[PDB]
Design a protein around this nucleic acid. Structure first.
Ligand SMILES: [Mg+2]
Ligand SMILES: [Mg+2]
Ligand SMILES: [Mg+2]
Ligand SMILES: [Mg+2]
Ligand SMILES: [Mg+2]
Ligand SMILES: [Mg+2]
Ligand SMILES: [Mg+2]
Ligand SMILES: [Mg+2]
Ligand SMILES: [Mg+2]
Ligand SMILES: [Mg+2]
Ligand SMILES: [Mg+2]
Ligand SMILES: [Mg+2]
Ligand SMILES: [Mg+2]
Ligand SMILES: [Mg+2]
Ligand SMILES: [Mg+2]
Ligand SMILES: [Mg+2]
Lengths: 147, 102, 210, 203
RNA sequence: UCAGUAACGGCGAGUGAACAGGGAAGAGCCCAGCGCCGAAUCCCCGCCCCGCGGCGGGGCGCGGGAAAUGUGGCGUACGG
RNA sequence: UAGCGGCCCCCGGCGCGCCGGGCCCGGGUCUUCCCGGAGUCGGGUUGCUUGGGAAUGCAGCCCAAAGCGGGUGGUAAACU
RNA sequence: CUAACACGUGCGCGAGUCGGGGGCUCGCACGAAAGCCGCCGUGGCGCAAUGAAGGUGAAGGCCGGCG
């Protein structure tokens, strides 16, 4: 609202909060990002290093869909299925292990970060990591690849 | 052992049976028909050959094969078209030589 | 001029952008008009489905979405022929038909055939002449219960199959999935160069023997 | 039929037979005037292919267009401005000479509608095109269901709006990754759609 | 929405799409050619009958013309 | 003003019936035949244009096709 | 005034959050509002970073079993 803005409190002060020595002129330093290498060089180098120059290869017809690969972590791994699944597996005595499919829930690669509760799991995914594999093996379980 | 389908490798991809079917009739275009061959050879017989074609035929007759290929490529365009044209001209020359001998 | 600290910005307002501005003050009126036209057409086609012709099952054509199932443009001729539907009669009895789509697999073809057979079993066909019915027609008593249905006909669902919890055997507990992926990548990368090396080794052995 | 033979003949433009013919015709056309009605198509097969039918109401005009490029119409040089716009005599027109010929024929005959056109001969300084026109008010076409589309008012001056086969080629119309400049109606439409702000009601 | 992204740019200032995905809407078709049908096709003038304020339908004309340098029917890549 | 309020006039659209006119029409299997658009594609160069980068698109000039061919598969080239 | 960004503040929900586009609501004084969608969360931002790229991708500490 215009009621609460600084302009209302600024009426009557000739200057309008912009100084008498240096006025409020149009474009004292140039428009936009001008002088990035000449008279704004200090600011550009101090606050945006690496701005100027080229690096890396050019990929012309990039399609993000080819590289689409969402990831999940082992601490979140048990949240894909319902709690009743996990508790039933926990108090089960036959040794049967529930099957968790991350592709069904929309994940492609499993990365092993969190601690895993001690019960067998059949994790089926598209890609695995070495540490996630070893975590699943240590907790007791199976890793299954799907396409 | 275990052979799980994978997203990577030589046999990457979800497995599914692939059903055979008759190819679409649109794919048949360009196939040479007997009547069309008859028409084209009649027209060639009445017309003759282009000047560049006969110059290339002279080059092949004197057996400068690389020169003929380079000249045809320059005169016509792509290397594939040049190779096809050179093959057809050599076939024409062979047919003419056989007819002259017999 | 840059202030103390902040982001470098590239606003795309260096053209005469104020002359080409699309205000949306007619959005509610547009929605009202589209609705009215929708109900007008629904009334126009009296017993027919409001949504339109049934459509087929298709898979999204990308690694990002190939797990999902859409509604396609129309049934293809292979599916129509194997379901016993003429390509010209399908359009006039309510089946969307396109001739561009192929059928590389068999599961999708069979699923769409099942869909078409279910649609034939479900639809009610009115007499071509209201007085005298014909052989390929529906009897009179169920005509009294023919009504429009809202939404797409037989809507598409993404159904996920559970398998029950299994028991572990030692056979799949010795499977090195990460190692398998790494060697699969290596083999795919080095397949061609290995073939060329084998070829030149073979020709060198032949040369040495000769 | 004879058409197939004719077509395969005309494809052999470097043969001595066709070369002699083309020479003789080109001489005759150059001797004639710049725009005149031909009694009958020179290429019956090509007229058939493009849509001509030997019935009343179909007329054919043979026209010649001066060859070459397009030099900038500026007083001496004087294309005042930055050096990037100093070019005078190496520029090229955006439309083809076939389209220019069709538009000239359509402008001269304002009571007819242009259907298509074809090339019949050329030389160093001229190009010769025969263009098919249709009289839209003749009963012979107004009573024929499949050709009465051209009698609609929407199809006035197709060559002037770039709707003929020759005119369309210059618009960059197509499907695929090669023709992204004209997604939508045309270049104008694509540029408009890309260069407006969609200031929504809520934002 | 992808996306101020892939990319272009004294690679500086700046410029800059598309595919997929969700929706609004949704509708498909016709020639030339290749061939088969005694040109089986079309326009116009005269007389008779109908209504004619969007000049049409039927019949009779040893009436005229177009058209074989090709009109009409079947038929077009989904095959015929 | 409100009202699935009243009265009168005119035009339309949907159904029904009558006369006249045209129309003789489809599907499956087997056998035999047939099937395509040229100064166009494409190449070189020049100029403009594009995010399109050893040339995205357009145009002028020169060269200029093929039929298991031709186009596309976002880095030029040969083989596959 | 519009757009972008940064930071500070107030409110709702919270590892989630957000219908802005569309649709359903006998369209219509207000009402062009408001309500609803949940198998309309497509999608955006966040939940993972790093490398030019191929790619890889986030603890471990004690005893019995061959110091
Ligand atoms: Mg003061
Ligand atoms: Mg100052
Ligand atoms: Mg000072
Ligand atoms: Mg200022
Ligand atoms: Mg300052
Ligand atoms: Mg221009
Ligand atoms: Mg071209
Ligand atoms: Mg973003
Ligand atoms: Mg610089
Ligand atoms: Mg620009
Ligand atoms: Mg899309
Ligand atoms: Mg819809
Ligand atoms: Mg014919
Ligand atoms: Mg430019
Ligand atoms: Mg490449
Ligand atoms: Mg600041």
């Amino acid at each position: 609202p215009s009621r609460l803005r600084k302009t209302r409190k600024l009426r009557g002060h000739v200057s309008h909060g912009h100084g008498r020595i240096g006025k409020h002129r149009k474009h004292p330093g140039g428009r936009g990002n001008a002088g990035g290498m000449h008279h704004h060089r200090i600011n550009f180098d101090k606050y945006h290093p690496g701005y100027f120059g080229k690096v890396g290869m050019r990929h012309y017809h990039l399609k993000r869909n080819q590289s689409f690969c969402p990831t999940v972590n082992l601490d979140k791994l048990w949240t894909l299925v319902s709690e009743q699944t996990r508790v039933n597996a926990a108090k089960n005595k036959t040794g049967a292990a529930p099957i968790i499919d991350v592709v069904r829930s929309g994940y492609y690669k499993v990365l092993g970060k969190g601690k895993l509760p001690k019960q067998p799991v059949i994790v089926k995914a598209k890609f695995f990591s070495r540490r996630a594999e070893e975590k699943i093996k240590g907790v007791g379980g199976a890793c299954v690849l799907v396409a | 052992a275990l052979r799980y389908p994978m997203a990577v490798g030589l046999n990457k991809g979800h497995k599914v049976t692939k059903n055979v079917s008759k190819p679409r009739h649109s794919r048949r275009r360009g196939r040479l028909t007997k009547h069309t061959k008859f028409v084209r050879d009649m027209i060639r017989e009445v017309c003759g050959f282009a000047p560049y074609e006969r110059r290339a035929m002279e080059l092949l007759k004197v057996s400068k094969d690389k020169r003929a290929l380079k000249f045809i490529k320059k005169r016509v365009g792509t290397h594939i078209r040049a190779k096809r044209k050179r093959e057809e001209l050599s076939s024409v020359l062979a047919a003419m030589r056989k007819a002259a001998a017999k | 001029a840059p202030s103390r600290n902040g982001m470098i910005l590239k606003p795309h307002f260096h053209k005469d952008w104020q002359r080409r501005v699309a205000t949306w003050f007619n959005q509610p009126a547009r929605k009202i008009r589209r609705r009215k036209a929708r109900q007008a057409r629904a009334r126009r086609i009296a017993p027919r489905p409001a949504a339109g012709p049934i459509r087929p099952i298709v898979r999204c054509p990308t690694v990002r979405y190939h797990t999902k199932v859409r509604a396609g443009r129309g049934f293809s001729l292979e599916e129509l022929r194997v379901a016993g539907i003429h390509k010209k009669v399908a359009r006039t009895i309510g089946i969307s038909v396109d001739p561009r789509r192929r059928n590389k697999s068999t599961e999708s073809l069979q699923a769409n055939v099942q869909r078409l057979k279910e649609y034939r079993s479900k639809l009610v066909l009115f007499p071509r002449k209201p007085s005298a019915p014909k052989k390929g027609d529906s009897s009179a008593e169920e005509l009294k219960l023919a009504t429009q249905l809202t939404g797409p006909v037989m809507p598409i669902r993404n159904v996920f199959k559970k398998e029950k919890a299994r028991v572990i055997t030692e056979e799949e507990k010795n499977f090195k999935a990460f190692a398998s992926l790494r060697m699969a990548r290596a083999n795919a990368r080095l397949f061609g160069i290995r073939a060329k090396r084998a070829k030149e080794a073979a020709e060198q052995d032949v040369e040495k023997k000769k | 039929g004879a058409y197939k033979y004719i077509q395969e003949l005309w494809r052999k433009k470097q043969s001595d037979v066709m070369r002699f013919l083309l020479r003789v015709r080109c001489w005759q056309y150059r001797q004639l005037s710049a725009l005149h009605r031909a009694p009958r198509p020179t290429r019956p097969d090509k007229a058939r292919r493009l849509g001509y039918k030997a019935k009343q109401g179909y007329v054919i005009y043979r026209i010649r267009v001066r060859r070459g490029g397009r030099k900038r119409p500026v007083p001496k040089g004087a294309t005042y401005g930055k050096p990037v716009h100093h070019g005078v005599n190496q520029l090229k027109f955006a439309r083809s000479l076939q389209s220019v010929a069709e538009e000239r024929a359509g402008r001269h005959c304002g009571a007819l509608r242009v259907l298509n056109s074809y090339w019949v001969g050329e030389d160093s300084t001229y190009k010769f095109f025969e263009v098919i026109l249709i009289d839209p008010f003749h009963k012979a076409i107004r009573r024929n269901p499949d050709t009465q589309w051209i009698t609609k008012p929407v199809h006035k001056h197709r060559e002037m709006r770039g709707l003929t086969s020759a005119g369309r080629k210059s618009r960059g119309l197509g499907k695929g990754h090669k023709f992204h400049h004209t997604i939508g109606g045309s270049r104008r439409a694509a540029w408009r759609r890309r260069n407006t702000l969609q200031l929504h009601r809520y934002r």
